[PDB]
Design a protein around this ligand. Sequence first.
Ligand SMILES: Nc1ncnc2c1ncn2[C@@H]1O[C@H](COP(=O)(O)OP(=O)(O)NP(=O)(O)O)[C@@H](O)[C@H]1O
Lengths: 304, 304
Amino acid sequence: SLIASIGELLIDLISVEEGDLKDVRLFEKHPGGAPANVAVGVSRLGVKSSLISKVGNDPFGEYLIEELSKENVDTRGIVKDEKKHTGIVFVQLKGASPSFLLYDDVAYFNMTLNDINWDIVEEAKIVNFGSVILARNPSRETVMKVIKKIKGSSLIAFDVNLRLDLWRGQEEEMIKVLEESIKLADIVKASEEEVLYLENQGVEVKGSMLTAITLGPKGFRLIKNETVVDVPSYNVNPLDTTGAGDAFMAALLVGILKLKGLDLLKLGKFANLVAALSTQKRGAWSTPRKDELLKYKEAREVLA
Amino acid sequence: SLIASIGELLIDLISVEEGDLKDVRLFEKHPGGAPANVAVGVSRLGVKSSLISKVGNDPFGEYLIEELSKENVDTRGIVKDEKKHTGIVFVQLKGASPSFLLYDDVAYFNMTLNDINWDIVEEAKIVNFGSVILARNPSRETVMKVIKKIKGSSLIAFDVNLRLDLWRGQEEEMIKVLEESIKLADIVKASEEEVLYLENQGVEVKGSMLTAITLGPKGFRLIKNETVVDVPSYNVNPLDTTGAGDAFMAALLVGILKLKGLDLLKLGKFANLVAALSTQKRGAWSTPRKDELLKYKEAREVLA
Ligand SMILES: Nc1ncnc2c1ncn2[C@@H]1O[C@H](COP(=O)(O)OP(=O)(O)NP(=O)(O)O)[C@@H](O)[C@H]1O
């Protein structure tokens, strides 16, 4: 029962104080990258996890592999780039206007077909990927080729996770690769904003097997073949919602992998529980551990 | 008179705690880059200073330009790159073995001939550069062409500032460029360690007009045509010596510009004073300001 994530793996330099990145003085270093965040979540839920990515031959690349190893995420598919350094992004999560500065000339955007460990990806039942990694070549063509290649042997999950800043000057190609990725996906996760934006350009944001649309404060919605199920969010006191989204995706993939048929109700309750609890942990890796979850019936239904 | 510096301008992310960069958790952001440090030093000493470099069209590029402007440094020659981000370097100054992680695929290494403001360069009486910017093309060929084109129309200063990590795989090409740069230099500055490294590979570390060899805390030595002067450092209890070298250079260049002749005595004392006092300020921009210097006889002789 393997779940493989392929994409960006990087260092998040999170602003410690408020203000535009221009005026932030202090930063905290943490591991980041949607695919890596989900990989860690999947692992915490008790499912063997693998990450396919590329870091530089430097201290930060070493740091990320170490942190991933501590979470028991299979790191064999993470290649070290001798020319490009570990990906980094400076982020400001605070304030009404969260912002970021992502360095694109880095290792994870430099993946080529010869970097892919095919044994690992062919061994997975579900392969997860996002749009961020597709923002630049060679990683874009590489990822698309890998997906097209394993289609049929593995369920393909795609988190839209759209970041317009990463496509300035190539919006036409963006629409094309996103649409192509969606059509290749059995599982598609997106926000209503992303659904509107995309559909407002002739692109239908839907998975062939399952679609999950996040509604921010209203919770989320699980759509399958005209059968729609809405799930309001739990009312709790969040300490940090930074990793909620990826905690949700992890849960959703683990649930799909675990339950016989795709029972939207049980899946929704499980996903919801994981996300809700993730808000009680700090950081990008806030997914709760299997243990903390067994105390819940909505979790035993999928993990136990 | 105007002194122009050409080279790296970047963001220094300084480790807050000790330890390997892999483990450092907190980093403080500050403006950095030898040429920029010298540019600021020159302006503080009351001389018109211009910096020729390239930053990204991003928050950090804006931060650097703003900071330089607060120091009255002419930034007209600082170009914004639409394709590369602002240079950055993660730094560990603490410990027995300080280290760094310099991101090389950044804006300041991507300078082309059309990025150079020739008006500013030609108008300068002294043009200063260092070896770091020569680490990668196109900046390397660009800087060499500029120096060769003004050679003879302006004094040329070169701070060896040797960083081996930046030349791995190209150690031989390194020696060639340093040799040629030193030979194009009227004024050469280097530490005794560097002198013993180059001359040990058939490289003579000497300027055609003046040579400055530093000896760390002990002091420095000014050499001009077989005339060797030893300047023992003034006694001080250092708060931070990070910017001492660049403060020394800024002083050395302002002295050379102001002094009718090349009185190595009036030059030594001045540079010695400026460097010594710089140890009383924290950070890469530690050059004392002119107003703090007018209280010293050794300084008035040069500025007043
Ligand atoms: N503790 C100190 N007390 C007095 N003067 C100092 C002290 N440390 C440095 N200096 C002065 O500042 C000058 C700068 O030297 P240093 O910091 O070694 O710069 P550098 O030669 O560029 N070395 P680097 O660029 O770090 O490889 C010295 O030659 C001294 O004259």
